[PDB]
Amino acid sequence: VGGLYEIKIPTNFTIVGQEEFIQTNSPKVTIDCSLFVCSNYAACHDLL
Amino acid sequence: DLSGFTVKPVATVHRRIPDLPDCDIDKWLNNFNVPSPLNWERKIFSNC
Numbered sequence: 001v002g003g004l005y006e007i008k009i010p011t012n013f014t015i016v017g018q019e020e021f022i023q024t025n026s027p028k029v030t031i032d033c034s035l036f037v038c039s040n041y042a043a044c045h046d047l048l
Numbered sequence: 049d050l051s052g053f054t055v056k057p058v059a060t061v062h063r064r065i066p067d068l069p070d071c072d073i074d075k076w077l078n079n080f081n082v083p084s085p086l087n088w089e090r091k092i093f094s095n096c
């Protein structure tokens with residue numbers, strides 16, 4: 001309108017909080033391949 | 049991380065139903081009235 005534009009400017013405000021979880025680690029899984037594949041069985045450990 | 053061990057069994061548990069009769073399987077197999085393949089006979093042995 002002439003040289004001027006209509007703008008909504010804030011007249012009041014507050015502070016808002018926002019949470020953000022970022023994963024940086026995970027459970028350190030470890031496998032005993034021999035115990036998993038063959039358990040206690042000697043005949044399996046031989047073939048493995 | 050060394051290979052997985054298992055605790056050694058310290059005793060043996062053996063269970064069987066006592067005082068069951070003999071199955072007599074030989075008496076039935078040695079019976080001289082032998083059937084042909086056409087009329088092959090069956091016997092079922094349990095609790096013996």
Ligand SMILES: *[C@@H]1O[C@H](CO)[C@@H](O)[C@H](O)[C@H]1NC(C)=O
Binds near residue numbers: 011013
């Ligand atoms: C701003 O907003 C808060 C919450 O609605 C209110 O308590 C406060 O009086 C307001 N201030 C003005 C200048 O409007």
